[PDB]
């Protein structure tokens, strides 16, 4: 199993046609430099878990934008299908109007670069990538088809990475804003471990 | 990496510390149960003990849903045991009920695609493996940020639910939430009701 | 530039999920043995020329069925997209109910086997294949994207191939049922050439 | 199966000896730049369907020339055979005098570049190619041996490609001059679809 | 430069369609076992030297058949062309009725096996082969395009090979029936050399 | 089976030690530019047919020199053997004095370049080559071991190639000086074919 | 990945993180140029023979430093483990404070370069290397796991190499300071051999 | 740099001619099964350090034999040289009285198998191997040319391996008979570390 | 430089046509089993040193036959040349009276197998091989072209090999029948060395 | 079986340590430029035929030096062994003082370059090489182990090669100074052959 997506390395470059505010526009990974990016793939337009994930992120977009973070979704469907899906009512399993870009990957090049393409199925699994403001890949979350991801966990992870970027302390298991962190040194670590126990 | 979602999780075997003793442990020992199998970078470091303890102190939440937990690093079994015998207040683990698997040769780490060639240890990679030995979920964190027991629980529960019912789990699903019939007509029960 | 589609050789085997009467069904090339098959690819669901070709064949399907000929359409879109497109009114560029199976080629395997896949675009061009009842490929028609195919011409070709299969004769340029044909030998041919000259 | 002939790419260059106005002349693909070109192969001089196709295009040549289009025929026969066939009466299965060039491909190089050469037979199948004024290949039509092509369909295609070149609307299935066309975008397309339905 | 034609070895096998007494028939090299065969290639039907060679052998065929020798001619032209050429009057550069089979080699496989195919021209040079009753190649005569072969020389050679096949002795330069031969032995050869000197 | 001797291409270059008027001299193919060259191989000094061929050419040398043509013979024997053979009386199967250079090819390099070397025997067959004044190979005549070549035919051929070189008409089967030739043109050729028939 | 450690060649370069007086420091082989270096690997922190070796050298360090020799130990454990082991009481199988750098080789690159890595075990055997002030490898001692090395023998060897470096006389079996040495010359050697015997 | 000698694996098989009690005898590694073997190479007969090593081990052979251990020495010299050297008095740099076999390795096969051959010099460095009674290699000691090995250290090592083989406790740095050993268990080890500290 | 002739191995097999008692016969290396064979190549019939060598060995053949040894000579010349050279008087540089076989190696296979072929010259150097009664090659003597070999040295060598075959003592430099020989053992050799000194 | 030693080509370069006048010196083939060199290998110091060969040349050395010819001997033994052997009395099979350099070839490189190395034995056979003053190899003499070479024959060959270098003449079988020689040309040779016969 291959992939160019490697944590602590620059996220693999991508560019393509996206639907943005109902129109076709060219979108590039580099458009997002200077901001964190939640870049996630979903299997297929007009299916089941997928709309719920796209809608979940879209409807909570301000929780990301308020922390200098953007969100882009991608699938192997065409831009025409993305737009048709946006124009399908939510009650019919459509997206309705959406504020996050829907990127099209008809050739599968982007999916393969990110290691999320399913050769037997001709679409991706549920792969989500957290990329920092410097374009470095920090986190990879891959789900099998029948189980959707979590916006809340994605937010926690974004906050965690921004926190450690800024402060140089590290984040324990389950860390959320306000939680105790650790000075990553054999002596400094004791402040955390003695206070906790 | 041999770790591919929807395929058999790559076989592994090695020496682990279990109840303070050295024991040979094999992936196939867990068939019939879900397994949360996770790597952590290094004994005697910082985020790592918090992760092992977080899972360890909540182990019964897993065992009660037919799920086991195993942790692995490139450290030796002697180091694992010394770390267990180090007080939590000193950044140690204290007694622990989760097996600590040793991967000195790096073979297991490489098979799971979590080995860092530049560093000589793993990143924070967690794998959810079902009772049939099929890999269902991969979570990989860069070094500075720990994983989440809450999210791991949610995922195991979701996969067990979808295994049983064949309905699929929306974004953010937790026990008691609405699920979807994966059928062009059936799905409307979910989409219509929600909206 | 490669392909497995060779005229006078067995048409490359295919199988996949198709929409048939609003339901997802597995469909195989071999299901059509015993009958002529018009098997055509079109670029993309929810686009422009494509629906007009599918509707043109669909609305004239009995002209094919009455001559022991079936019609199957294929694209790189998913079965869910095919069904959503069927459920889109014709006035909005949808298909409406359709009696031609719509085959899904998400992996691009079928398209590549037939040599109609566009690597730069992630979809096929307008490729149509006429396959006889023995499974042998008899005719290949490839159009660039902007120009739709012709049901009249396709029908004429099916009739011609069926006619030459049955009789010891070959069909001159522009032949339609009822037109003069030629006996393919140095002496027999003169009955044709003397007649019309 | 291999070939250099790819739709939307430059038609493979060719050059050779042709019979033109009863004389041997060198002829090149690039001689037709600035005009559309119907370039077609036929199996064999002194056979059956072939003369009918050559005669059909030749006798209707003005229908092509009046729309800035030329026609060239090609086979694996020699220029001496082409000329002897021209000097054979139509009632004997000859061509009689002819106004389209008859290109010779004795080495099979041109046939192979166009993917129409039959290795087991030592001649071509019925392959026809429509090449635009910029030298780009737009259309490929390949028939098995028993069935002749259609001058009328060939004209329809040339007209359609010239129309879409000029207007940037696209041509529905069965389009002929005077027919409705489609604006190729998600909103503009509704002019066509709402009107027709 | 490659070839399978090797003197003193079995002549390379061939089989194909020939025109024989106005009909198309399958012909094989092995059809001629038990007789000497003069098997010759000529460049092109409807050309200049070629018919003179075919006619020269043809009109003297009984001089070959009276010494148990058959003659076969072959070119890269089709059987249809061979027949049309036969049906062309000699005064127009045709063959008229011919008793020598005309083999067709459209694929060029026979020509290439015999090493006489011109890659730059798409036809053969003037290559003649003398094959004995055991199928062993005994003589190869290859002429550039402008110069015809000789029936007299070909007859001399066939007679010489038959003579040496039958008797112990070998044939000096210029040998014709009735000429002195040589005993191929350091002592025996002296009968010849002493006599002539 | 390979070779560098290709008709209508430059004869393969050779150089070596020859016996010329009883002396050892270095000789080169290029020494013969500006003249036709009959270059011939023979199997073995002190054998049977070989001396008859060398003598047949040598004794009629002036018939070649009067038409600007030279003759060179070659074998795999040494120059020392050539000279000893020259010094052997004709009545003993020797050559006697001779004005044709005898070229030595001990390494077999020249023989292999001309495709006349017999791997099983360690000497050449009877291969004769006609090379024109421009160094282009025009004719190849290869005989099996038991049958000698013809000086008359070789002369006829040289005369023919020289004629066609000069006049650009072509020589029919059996042409000799004074015979009718053909203008190589579909119209021009009728002067010959009408006259003859 | 072959061993690069060759006696009489430059010791393979290494660099890494070491614990030195309780702190993490980058350490390089080249930091030791100008002095002899005893560079030794041990299997595993927190085991059995290993601490006894580190302590044996550690406690006798001045015996090395007084002969201008440094000592460095290395294993496949991390710097964090080295530090934790140093902070473990000797009574519990720990090191206590230590004046020898503990080098970490987590990636195994160094161990493999020195040929001491055990592929089946994931750690080194007991390999000790003596490297001179010019960086040349002079001595290799490899022990299987259950048997510890000797500080006495190590000292003896360092002294012998320094003696022979200085004087160019060579050191007999069992040499210690004050022992007889040999002039490496066929005549000079007799001073040793005669005195001894 | 390669070798077949690997600690904890079977020592590479060897066999060859040795001088034993003044006579040439074939000797095999397998002759020593059931006993420990100190197998050592030395550079060259008639040199300097080498005789002192052979003499040192030989003169102390009973200290090995009384612990079920044999000693064999090997160099790239011939058996004839070994014997002449034995017949040379010690005062002349010869071996004089001797009881250990001197194995000859003229082809360098054995030296290369053991990884002690010096390609630049044509002889071996000072490599010593300790092989157990099961034929497993336990210890490797390699010295550069100017410095001899130690009989006392070799004895210490043989005794240590025999002790660990027997008792399953392990030997600390500098162990000698009578010294403290360690139980290789995280609990059992404490008996040693608490006692010593 | 390559060859199959290796001292102490079976001499490479050969077979071919030889001149024996003025007749052509097939001859094989194995015809000589049970006898020693002096097998030698010479460059070229009708040259200079070569006849003196053939004559020298031949005229003294009884000195070989009376010690169970035969002699065979070989060159790259033909059997016809060998015979012609035999029939040439010695006073003219011929062989005249002869009793040793002259082997022919036209293909150079035998010469190449024995490593005596000169690729630049097309003949052998002066190579002589002494092969024993068991067919094992014992001695190789290779001379550059200008210098002849010695019958007396060859006899000395044949006698030496037979003596050592029979007695198992070895022959000192310059040994001839009746000379002292050596017992090849460190003690036995002293009989020779003490006596002679 | 390969080698770099080719007659008529530059002798393969060598350099190494030799014993000269009882001392070790580096010696190079190029050191002998301007003089003939007899360069010979012998199997083993302290053996049987070998000393007799070294002594036989050594005791007649002035017969070589007086004709500008040097002698060098070489074996796979060390320089230390050579010197020890020199210091062994002749009556004990030693060399005693010697004026011929004894070259050491411990690595076997020189022996392999000259094709005299025995892979199965780890030493050379008895190979002798005569190298002229320009460094060209002129003669190779290879003996199996049990039979020594000849100083008489070696001197004869050196004399002959020197003679043929100086004069335009070649040396018959068995030539010694004062013997008749041949002028190597077809006419001049007769002066030798007529006189002898």
UniProtKB/Swiss-Prot annotation, chains A, C, D, E, F, G, H, I, J:
Keywords: Antioxidant, Cytoplasm, Disulfide bond, Endoplasmic reticulum, Oxidoreductase, Peroxidase, Redox-active center, Signal. Its EC number is 1.11.1.24. Its main location: cytoplasm. Transmembrane segments: none annotated. Residues 5-163 form the Thioredoxin domain. It is found in: Cytoplasm; Endoplasmic reticulum. The keyword Oxidoreductase applies. Belongs to the peroxiredoxin family. AhpC/Prx1 subfamily. The active site is a conserved redox-active cysteine residue, the peroxidatic cysteine (C(P)), which makes the nucleophilic attack on the peroxide substrate. The peroxide oxidizes the C(P)-SH to cysteine sulfenic acid (C(P)-SOH), which then reacts with another cysteine residue, the resolving cysteine (C(R)), to form a disulfide bridge. The disulfide is subsequently reduced by an appropriate electron donor to complete the catalytic cycle. In this typical 2-Cys peroxiredoxin, C(R) is provided by the other dimeric subunit to form an intersubunit disulfide. Homodimer; disulfide-linked, upon oxidation. 5 homodimers assemble to form a ring-like decamer. Can form heterodimers with PRDX1. This is Peroxiredoxin-4. It comes from Homo sapiens.
UniProtKB/Swiss-Prot annotation, chain B:
GO terms for biological process: cell redox homeostasis; extracellular matrix organization; hydrogen peroxide catabolic process; I-kappaB phosphorylation; male gonad development; negative regulation of male germ cell proliferation; protein maturation; response to oxidative stress. It catalyses: a hydroperoxide + [thioredoxin]-dithiol = an alcohol + [thioredoxin]-disulfide + H2O. The keyword Cell cycle does not apply. The enzyme can be inactivated by further oxidation of the cysteine sulfenic acid (C(P)-SOH) to sulphinic acid (C(P)-SO2H) and sulphonic acid (C(P)-SO3H) instead of its condensation to a disulfide bond. One of its GO terms (cellular component) is cytosol. Keywords: Antioxidant, Cytoplasm, Disulfide bond, Endoplasmic reticulum, Oxidoreductase, Peroxidase, Redox-active center, Signal. The active site is at 48 (cysteine sulfenic acid (-soh) intermediate). Homodimer; disulfide-linked, upon oxidation. 5 homodimers assemble to form a ring-like decamer. Can form heterodimers with PRDX1. This is Peroxiredoxin-4. The lineage of its organism: Eukaryota, Metazoa, Chordata, Craniata, Vertebrata.
